[PDB]
Amino acid sequence: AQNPNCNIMIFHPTKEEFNDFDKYIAYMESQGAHRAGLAKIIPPKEWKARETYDNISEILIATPLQQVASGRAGVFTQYHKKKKAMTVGEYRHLANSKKYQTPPHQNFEDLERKYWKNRIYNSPIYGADISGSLFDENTKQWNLGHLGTIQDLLEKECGVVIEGVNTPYLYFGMWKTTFAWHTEDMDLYSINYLHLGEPKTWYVVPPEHGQRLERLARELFPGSSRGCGAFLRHKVALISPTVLKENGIPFNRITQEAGEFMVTFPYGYHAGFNHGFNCAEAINFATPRWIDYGKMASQCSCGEARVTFSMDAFVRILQPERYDLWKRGQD
Numbered sequence: 266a267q268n269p270n271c272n273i274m275i276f277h278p279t280k281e282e283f284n285d286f287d288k289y290i291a292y293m294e295s296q297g298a299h300r301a302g303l304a305k306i307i308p309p310k311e312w313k314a315r316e317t318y319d320n321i322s323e324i325l326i327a328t329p330l331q332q333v334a335s336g337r338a339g340v341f342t343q344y345h346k347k348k349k350a351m352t353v354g355e356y357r358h359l360a361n362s363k364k365y366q367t368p369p370h371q372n373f374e375d376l377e378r379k380y381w382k383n384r385i386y387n388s389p390i391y392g393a394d395i396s397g398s399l400f401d402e403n404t405k406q407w408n409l410g411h412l413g414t415i416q417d418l419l420e421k422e423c424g425v426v427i428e429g430v431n432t433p434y435l436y437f438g439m440w441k442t443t444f445a446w447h448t449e450d451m452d453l454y455s456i457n458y459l460h461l462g463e464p465k466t467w468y469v470v471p472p473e474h475g476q477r478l479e480r481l482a483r484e485l486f487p488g489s490s491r492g493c494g495a496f497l498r499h500k501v502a503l504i505s506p507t508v509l510k511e512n513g514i515p516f517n518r519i520t521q522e523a524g525e526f527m528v529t530f531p532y533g534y535h536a537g538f539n540h541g542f543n544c545a546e547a548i549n550f551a552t553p554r555w556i557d558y559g560k561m562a563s564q565c566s567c568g569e570a571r572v573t574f575s576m577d578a579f580v581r582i583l584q585p586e587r588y589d590l591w592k593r594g595q596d
């Protein structure tokens with residue numbers, strides 16, 4: 266079995282290998298990359314996402330989210346308070362202000378220590394989940410707005426045509442902005458490109474060990490667990506690496522820098538934080554190997570998770586027994 270310790274693998278495709286996206290995902294899996302839950306892909310030196318980032322300041326963040334924490338430094342939840350709209354240029358200035366800027370630090374490890382020690386005492390503002398793309402239309406390789414759609418993959422694999430669309434999302438981050446422990450909707454893959462700015466640190470649990478994380482989470486968030494049998498779908502719970510280590514949960518960590526892609530694999534729980542002002546782009550995708558994970562994905566039916574239009578068909582076709590209850594949670 267390849268990669269039996271489930272280490273995060275890093276790939277350096279040539280420009281020739283960068284032509285066929287599906288083929289390269291399958292290659293990475295042939296080397297055991299999925300066992301980690303997360304892989305890094307460094308694009309060939311010839312490639313670029315677009316010519317410059319000099320003209321992005323007028324993009325609107327219609328609903329910036331202030332991420333307010335509750336709990337203890339290593340075990341907390343966050344809720345999102347909606348703030349007034351602002352442009353990317355306004356948000357960048359905010360991120361660089363004395364109140365929100367990255368503190369002085371020695372290296373990524375020192376910054377990680379400061380994040381875990383101090384996150385809860387601050388409420389950073391995240392421009393998340395903004396529909397759109399920063400890939401130039403002329404970028405033909407690994408353009409996250411030009412991937413094969415998940416609806417077309419389900420149709421190719423299973424023969425059933427379904428409604429729905431699949432488009433990318435932009436994330437504008439600042440110091441301490443945080444992504445809670447989660448898997449993707451329907452345990453899909455995700456791909457994330459860090460277009461510009463400061464790094465993003467990721468933590469990930471191997472898919473084969475995801476239920477160990479879930480059991481810890483039920484212990485650490487016991488009211489939430491009674492409220493919902495899949496509460497990590499709410500995307501609000503954080504658990505630090507120190508706490509994970511104390512409880513014997515297998516995980517890995519890696520820092521993504523500007524110009525790098527990350528791929529999350531089906532049922533790979535992940536969480537992380539931004540180091541400073543940055544912009545990422547991400548989208549879900551599927552492969553044939555995903556179908557079995559989609560059929561087994563947990564679902565939130567308590568009403569909290571509320572998701573896209575396109576998840577309807579996935580539930581309806583892959584999980585018909587769950588469909589009625591899940592849809593009640595959507596309505």
Ligand SMILES: O=C(O)CNC(=O)C(=O)O
Nearest residue numbers: 436444455456457545547
């Ligand atoms: O970058 C973020 O805030 C969160 N991104 C992801 O969970 C992802 O790409 O799957």
Ligand SMILES: [Mg+2]
Nearest residue numbers: 321322323324
């Ligand atoms: Mg602009």
Ligand code: NI
Nearest residue numbers: 448449455529
């Ligand atoms: Ni994700």
Ligand SMILES: [Zn+2]
Nearest residue numbers: 493565567569
């Ligand atoms: Zn729920």
